[PDB]
Structure formats: C-alpha cells, structure tokens
Amino acid sequence: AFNDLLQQVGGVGRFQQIQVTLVVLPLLLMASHNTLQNFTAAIPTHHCRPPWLPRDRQGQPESCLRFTSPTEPCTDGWIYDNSTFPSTIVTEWDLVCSHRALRQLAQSLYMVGVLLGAMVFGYLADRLGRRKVLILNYLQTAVSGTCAAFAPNFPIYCAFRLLSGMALAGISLNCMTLNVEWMPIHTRACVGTLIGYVYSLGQFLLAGVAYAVPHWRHLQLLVSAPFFAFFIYSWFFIESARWHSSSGRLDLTLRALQRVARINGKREEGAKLSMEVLRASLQKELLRCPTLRHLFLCLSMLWFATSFAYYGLVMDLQGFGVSIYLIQVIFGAVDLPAKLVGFLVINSLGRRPAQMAALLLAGICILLNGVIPQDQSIVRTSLAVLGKGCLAASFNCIFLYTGELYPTMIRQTGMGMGSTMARVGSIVSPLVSMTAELYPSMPLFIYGAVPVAASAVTVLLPETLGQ
Ligand SMILES: CCCc1nc(C(C)(C)O)c(C(=O)O)n1Cc1ccc(-c2ccccc2-c2nnn[nH]2)cc1
Ligand SMILES: [Br-]
C-alpha cells in the first residue's frame, strides 16, 4: 500500500508541513478574486451630465434622465461620486442604466472561465502532471490579472478576467489534489478542513486590502501581484509520487520518495527503499447506471442550489445600509460560528436533517429580505448575515455528505463533477441578477426560492450517519 510507504519517510514531516503551507497560501487570495467584482465594480451614486435633473419619488435625482430645458436621455455623459469610490469599472466605461447588464456580464464571463478551468486543467493534470499544471496556473493568473488591470476598454477586461478564471480553477483543483497525494490517510480530514478554513479567511483579507486601496486598477493589480511571487517559488514543488506510479514512471517515484527522506531527516529509511522494494510495495457512468443516476441528480441539485444562492448574496453586499467594508468583515466573521453549529449538529443529528435545516433556514432568510422594507437596515442586514452563515454551513455539509454517499469507485469522479455543477450555479447567479431591471426584488425572490425547493431533494437521499 502507498499509504504505509508514505509513512516510511515519516508520514507528516518537515517536507509535508513546508509544502502544504506554501500550496495552501494562495488560497487566501482565491476568495478575493471570486469577490473582487464587488469592490472593483461597485456602483456609486450618479446622475446625468448637464451641458436639469428630475428627481424621483424618493427625493434623489433620477438617474440617466435630464430635462431638455431648465425629458431626454444622457448624451454628454454622467457625473459620479468620488466620496467613497474614487474609481471603479462602472465609472470608467459608463456601465450604468442602459448598460447595467455589462457589469454583471463581467462576473458571468469570469465564472465561465472558472468552469472551463476545472474542465480543461483537470484533464491537463492527468496527462502532464500536478506540479507542472500548478506552475502554469500561478503564472497565468498573474499575467492575466495584471493585464486586466490595464485593460483599455471593456471587452479586453472581460477576456482577461476569463483567463484569470481558468487559472484560478486549476489552482484550487490542484491545491487539494496535490496536498492529499503527499499526505497520509490518517491526516486526510485535517487537510480537508484546513482548505475550507483557509478559504474562509480570504474574506477578511479582501476587506483589509480594499479599504486601503479603493481604486479598481490598483486593487486589481495588488490582488494579482503576489501570484508572480508565488510562481517564483512554485518551481520548488515535488510532484505527487502516487501520480508518477499511475503514469508508469516508478523510477521517478523512487527518486521523489528518496528526496523526501533526506528533507525529513530520516535518510536511513530512504536508503533502504529501492526499486525492488518500491515495486513490491506498490503492486496494487454517473447517468449510465440507474443506481448511481438517481443518486446523482439529488446530489447535483444540492450542489447547484447551494452555490446558486451563495453568489447571489455575496455579490450583492451593497444596498444593506452599511458600508461594504464593514459588511465584508461581518460576512466573513459569521463563517466560523456557522461551521461550529453545523459541525456539532451534523455529528449529533445527522448529515441529512442538518443539510435540510441549513438549506431551508438559508432560503427563508434570503426570501424574507425582499419582503422586509428597505428602511429597516439593521434587521435586513442581520437576516442577510444569518442567511450567509446558513449557506456556508450547507457547503460544509454537502462536501461531507457527497463523499459518504458515493461508492469508492466513483467517489472521486462524483465529487469532481459534483463541484463542477456547483460552478454552473455561480454562472447563472449573475445572469439572474440581470433581471433586476424588470422588478427590483425579483432577483432576491429567486435566490430565496431555489434553496427552499432544494430542501425537498435532501429528503430523497439516504442518511449516512453511523453507516
Ligand atoms: C465558499 C465557496 C464555495 C465554492 N466556490 C466554488 C468556486 C469558486 C465556483 O470554484 C466552489 C466549487 O469549486 O464548486 N465551491 C464549492 C465548495 C464546497 C466545499 C468547500 C469546502 C468546505 C469545507 C472544507 C473544505 C472545502 C474544500 N474542499 N476543497 N476545496 N475546499 C469549498 C468549496
Ligand atoms: Br474553488
């Protein structure tokens, strides 16, 4: 068995600690990139440009309509507010009113890239390697991200944000994958938990960076800046030894394991390992099968709906009556208690009842936001914060539940394609937000009605607690 031989060089050790820390380090910036459209594309208060401006029923000047003489649409441009948002992509290329969907199109195009990033670079890691793909993904995001910060017009920004989406998907996919191939079976849950916790710490980093750097060009450049430094040390990564065995390169596998032995200091055991011993140790459809088919759609709907309403709330921080810098801190802050409640309930009640309670409660909070009047800022903000926490507690549960609900043969493929359909939800969520022109609370109603119907799916699943 490979697990027993991985413990020969000491199991978890100095090499394992050093590389896992460096591989998980860019995961802090993963949350910032996924949410960066909130700060780089924030919509400030604006009004038409006189060469004058009607006021709405609320009292503020009516946007994109001006009097012909002291009604006609804006022709000379728009005047924005520099008090809170000095420069965003909305102010730069006039993505207001008529071109309101263009701002959402940036996230949809970016989320198209992250979907194709898992599909393409997932296939590349099987043929090329896990270390080789990581090197080509730390560079790509740094080049694509920086080139996006200097985009001359809008189409160039969308094309260079899509490329950053493809590379970031490869980073996330090859972070957990490369980490588990170099770590023993015993320390497999610690890595899985650490990936999610490091992922949830990125919201705090985004708020701190965006507060000091409000400009969209400087914030985007600074966010993609470390990925050049990550590429500098990404060369010093040891390729997964198990993958080398699967590729018929046992000579490379022996060298990789020997190199680990000297790093951990147990070089005596590494010298014992040899090709004869290495070979002796390592001697060992989803919808096509109705049995797994009726298990796939139920899991797929949970992955889609949980992600569909997640990015329908994280992307819409503005409008709760609180500064977005404070809300981003609070949204990140509610993540840790939400897992604690979920993890305790999961082990005390069951994966299925907890998931249904987490999804149903999350759907109610989102749905009640549209009904509640916008005047009550504190209550409306609190319900959204509670809804965000319950959605996060659903992600942790569905990640655990999916693994236990799949046979060992198809578990790895099911989890990968199960997360793939989750990336599909993050694509449609910005698209649904584009219907806010038809009705103002319609996007919030839809984001709160899909998880409610998704909670009925979990009932059809079989409970796996204590089984
Ligand atoms: C908090 C964001 C949730 C999310 N975003 C994405 C995008 C950016 C579209 O890729 C996906 C996806 O890859 O499908 N997901 C799903 C996800 C589920 C569980 C977890 C998780 C939860 C707890 C502990 C660990 C993890 C985990 N496993 N692998 N990576 N993180 C992380 C992400
Ligand atoms: Br991800």
Domain harbouring 414, CATH code: 1.20.1250.20
User: Which long-range CB contacts under 8 A does 335-343 form with residues at least 24 apart?
Assistant: 335/200, 335/203, 335/389, 335/392, 336/200, 337/389, 338/389, 338/390, 338/392, 338/393, 339/196, 339/200, 339/392, 339/393, 339/396, 341/393, 342/393, 342/394, 342/396, 342/397, 343/396
Residues 341 and 404 grouped into a single domain: yes
284, 309, 335: which is the final residue of a domain?
284
CB atoms within 10 A of CB 247: 14
Segment holding 383, helix H or strand E: helix 377-404
From residue 380, give the alpha-carbon distance in Å to each of 319, 321, 368, 372: 10, 9, 8, 7
How would DSSP label each residue in 46-89?
A: EEE------B-SSSSBPTTEE-S---EE-SS-EEE-TTT-S--H
Q: Are residues 290 and 216 in the same domain?
A: no
Ligand 1 probe mutation, 30, 107, 119, 195, most atoms within 8 A of CB: 195
Contact 184, 3 (CB under 8 A): yes
Residue 58 CB-density burial (10 A; 0-12 exposed, 13-18 middle, 19+ buried): exposed
Do both 163 and 117 map to the same domain?
yes
**81 within some domain:** no
Ligand 2 center from residue 102 Cα (angstroms): 24
Rounded to whole angstroms, the Cα distance separating 63 from 80 reads 11
Nearest atom in ligand 1 to the alpha carbon of residue 111 is 9
Q: Judge whether 54 and 66 are in contact, CB under 8 Å.
A: yes
CA angle 114, 308, 446 (to 5 degrees): 145
CA distance 137 to 29: 14
In a domain, 71, yes or no: no
Tokens for 149, please give them: 């910060």
- Angle separating helix axes 189-200 and 27-35, nearest 10 degrees: 40
Residues 273, 413: one domain? no
- Is 173 in contact with 136 (CB distance < 8 Å)? no
The answer to whether 179 and 193 are in contact (CB under 8 A) is no
CA–CA gap between residue 372 and residue 382 (Å, rounded): 12
Q: Work out the angle between the directed axes of helices 130-149 and 216-224 (0-180°, nearest 10).
A: 160
Helix %, strand %, coil % of the chain (to 5): 70, 5, 25
Same domain membership, residue 398 and residue 318 = yes
Task: Note the Cα 186 to chain centre separation in Å.
Answer: 27
302 and 417 together in one domain = yes
* 380 in Cβ contact with 444 (< 8 Å): no
- Among the listed residues 47, 88, 53, 48, the one whose alpha carbon sits nearest the alpha carbon of residue 69: 53
> 170 with 137: CB under 8 angstroms?
yes
Residues 433 and 439 sit within 8 Å (Cβ to Cβ): no
Ligand 1 atom at minimal distance to the Cα of residue 422? 14
- Rg of the Cα atoms in the chain: 25
Distances (CA, A) of 116 to 297, 355, 421: 21, 28, 12
Q: How far is the CA of 68 from the centre of ligand 1 (A)?
A: 52
Instruction: Count other C-beta atoms under 10 Å from residue 439's C-beta.
Output: 11
Return the closest-CA partner of residue 351 out of 399, 388, 390: 399
| 212 and 296 within one domain | no
Q: Between vectors from CA 179 to CA 173 and to CA 180, what angle results, nearest 5°?
A: 100
Phi, psi of 328 (to 5 degrees): -60, -35
Does some domain include residue 131? yes
Count CA atoms closer than 13 A to 339's CA, side-chain side.
Answer: 14
What is the residue range of 359's domain? 286-467
Q: Does residue 335 lie in a domain region?
A: yes
Give the closest ligand to the alpha carbon of residue 33: 1
Q: 236, 265, 284 — which closes off a domain? A: 284
Pocket test for ligand 1, best of 198, 307, 428 (most atoms within 8 A of CB): 307
C-alpha to C-alpha distance for 240 and 371, rounded to whole angstroms: 52
Question: Is the same domain home to 321 and 213?
Answer: no
296 vs 287: CA distance, rounded Å? 7
Helix (H, G, I), strand (E, B) or coil at 34: helix
Domain count of the fold of the chain? 2
In terms of Cα–Cα distance, which of 461, 435, 295, 458 is closest to 363?
458
Q: Which residues of 287-312 are buried (b: 16+ CB within 10 A; e: fewer)?
A: eeeeebeebbebbbbbbbbbbbbbbb
User: To 10 degrees, what angle do helices 377-404 and 324-333 make?
Assistant: 40
CA distances from 381 to 318, 391, 406, 448 (A): 10, 15, 38, 15
Helix axes 189-200, 335-348, angle to 10 degrees: 150
Most informative mutation of 33, 37, 199 for ligand 1 (most atoms within 8 A of CB): 199
Measure the CA angle with vertex 369, ends 85 and 54; round to 5°. Answer: 50
Give the span between the Cα atoms of 288 and 417, in whole angstroms: 15
Q: Tell me whether residue 410 is in a domain.
A: yes
Return the best residue to mutate from 206, 340, 395 for the ligand 1 pocket (most ligand atoms within 8 A of CB).
395
Q: Which amino acid is at 239?
A: E
Nearest to 63 by CA among 82, 75, 50, 78: 78
d(CA 341, CA 182): 31
Same-domain check for residues 302 and 215: no
Say how many Å lie between the CA of residue 419 and the centre of ligand 2.
Answer: 9
Tell me the sheet residues that pair with 61.
55
Distance, CA of 32 to CA of 168 (rounded, Å) = 11
With 0-12 / 13-18 / 19 or more C-beta atoms within 10 angstroms meaning exposed / middle / buried, residue 212 is exposed
294 is a domain residue:
yes
The answer to whether residues 144 and 160 touch, using CB atoms and an 8 Å cutoff, is yes
Is residue 367 a contact partner of residue 445, using CB atoms and an 8 Å limit? yes
Q: Is residue 221 part of a domain?
A: yes
Resolution of the structure, angstroms:
3.5
Contact 404, 393 (CB under 8 A): no
> Do 276 and 290 fall into the same domain?
no
> According to the entry, how was the structure determined?
cryo-EM
DSSP state of 97: G
- Ligand 1 cavity residues, CB under 6 Å: 34, 114, 172, 176, 192-193, 195-196, 199, 307, 395-396, 399, 419, 422-423, 426
Answer whether residue 254 is part of any domain. Answer: yes
What's the token pair of residue 364?
A: 């109610």
Q: Nearest residue CA, atom 6 of ligand 1?
A: 423
Tell me how far apart the terminal alpha carbons of the chain are, to the nearest angstrom: 25
CA separation for the pair 305, 242 (Å, rounded)? 35
Which atom of ligand 1 sits closest to the CA of residue 193?
A: 24
Q: Let me know whether 297 and 277 are in one domain.
A: no
Residue ending a domain, choose from 284, 302, 333: 284
Name residue 193's amino acid.
T
Residues 294 and 275 in one domain: no
Cα–Cα distance for residue pair 422/429, rounded to 1 Å: 11
319: tokens are: 């409008």
- E strands present in 111-161: none
